[PDB]
Amino acid sequence: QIDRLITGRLQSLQTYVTQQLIRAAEIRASANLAATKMSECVLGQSKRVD
């Protein structure tokens, strides 16, 4: 029973870590886009449409 509980909790923790990694990749992409915007629109005049 202890082994079953350990396996279940470890699987839950690994699923949480995978979801956190995916969300971190998404947030990193969004942050790179935000940094590009900060460098272009703020520190200059970007002629890029929309």
Binding site: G8, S12, T15, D50
Partner: protein, 49 residues
Amino acid sequence: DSTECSNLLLQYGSFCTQLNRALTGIAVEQDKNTQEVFAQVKQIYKTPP
């Protein structure tokens, strides 16, 4: 179409709800991307004859 299987599965936790939420988020972001790519102008223009 099983009864005891569901009774034993309900003891694992919120895996069902988590997978359903992930699939729903995927389905929503698909339409979000489809709207962001094509729907950029809120006015349907028509070419003259």
